[PDB]
Amino acid sequence: SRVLLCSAGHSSMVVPEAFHAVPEGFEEVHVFTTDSEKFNPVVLNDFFHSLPNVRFSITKCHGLADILNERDFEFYQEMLWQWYLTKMPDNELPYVCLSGGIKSMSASLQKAATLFGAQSVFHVLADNNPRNIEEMFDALQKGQIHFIEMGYEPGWAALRRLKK
Amino acid sequence: SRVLLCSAGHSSMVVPEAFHAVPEGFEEVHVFTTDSEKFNPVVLNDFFHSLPNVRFSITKCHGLADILNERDFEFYQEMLWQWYLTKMPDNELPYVCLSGGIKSMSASLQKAATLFGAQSVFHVLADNNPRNIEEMFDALQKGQIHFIEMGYEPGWAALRRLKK
RNA sequence: AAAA
C-alpha cells in the first residue's frame, strides 16, 4: 500500500493537492495537526470519504492548540513521531508531504522521515493557491500545482523495529 | 558581534520582530531572500533605517524568483550556504531566525546552522501578526511576540575554516 | 502552501 503522511494547517487544499503527487493516488492518507480551530477537518472528511478506495484519518495532538514555547514543541514532536511509527506501512516506506502546518511542525515531520524512513519527502506549491477542490482540479489540469522532491530517506531499520 | 541571519518572505515584519529575540539587540542583521518582485523590502528597510548603527544587508538569490522544482531549490541552497559562511562572524556563532520565507527556504537555513554552527536557532511567533512597525512595538510591549528556541548548534569547526 |  502507498501511504501518504501529512501535516495540515489552515489551507484545506494542501492535503488534497498532495494526494495527487503520484498518478495512482494513495491507498491511505493520514494527517497530523494541532487542536487549533484554524484547522477545519470538514472539507477533508468530505473529499476523502467521497473517494472509494482511500483510508483516511486525522490525528490531533490532543490538548495542544498552538506551538508557543519549547514544551509545546517537544510535546507535539513526541506525539508526531509515535504517530509516524504507527501509521507507516510494514513492508514499505511512506510518502511524506511537508507543506502543511507551521514551519516547526513541518520540520519535525522532516526529521521523523529522516529517522524512520520515507519513500519520498515532498512539498506541494500552487501558483494561485486553490481554495476548494474545484479550483484544485482546475489548477492541476493547467499545470499550476508543483511537486518538489526533497529526497528519499532510508531511515534506520533499527528504529522501525520499535513500533512493537 | 551578535549577528542575526534570517530568511525573508512577504510578511515584512518577521525580521524586525526577530531583532528583539535578545535584550541587547544585534550588531548586524543579514537577510537572504529570493529575487521575486513580490518581495517588498520597504517596511524592513524602514525599521533598520531607524537603527542606522546596526549593520544591515539584504542578499538576493540572483536570477531565482521562486522555488518551483528541485533545481531551483538546489541553486537556492548553494547560494544560501555560501552567504551563511560569508555573513557569520569570525569568532562566535551567529543567531538564526527560521520564521521567514517558504518552508523549504527555512529548512535549508536550519541545515546550514546545523553544519556551520549557530548560538541560537529560533522561531518568532505573533499573537495577531503585526502588519506595520507601530503594531509590532505595541505587540512587543504587551508580550504578544513569542520566541521558540529550536536548539544550539555547535556546527563543525572543519567546515567553518573554509571561509578561505 | 513566503510567521499554519
From TrEMBL, chains A, B:
ATP 2 binds at residue 164. ATP 3 binds at residue 164. ATP 1 binds at residue 161. This is Uncharacterized protein. The lineage of its organism: Bacteria, Pseudomonadati, Bacteroidota, Bacteroidia, Bacteroidales. The chain holds residues 2 to 165 of 600 of the full protein.
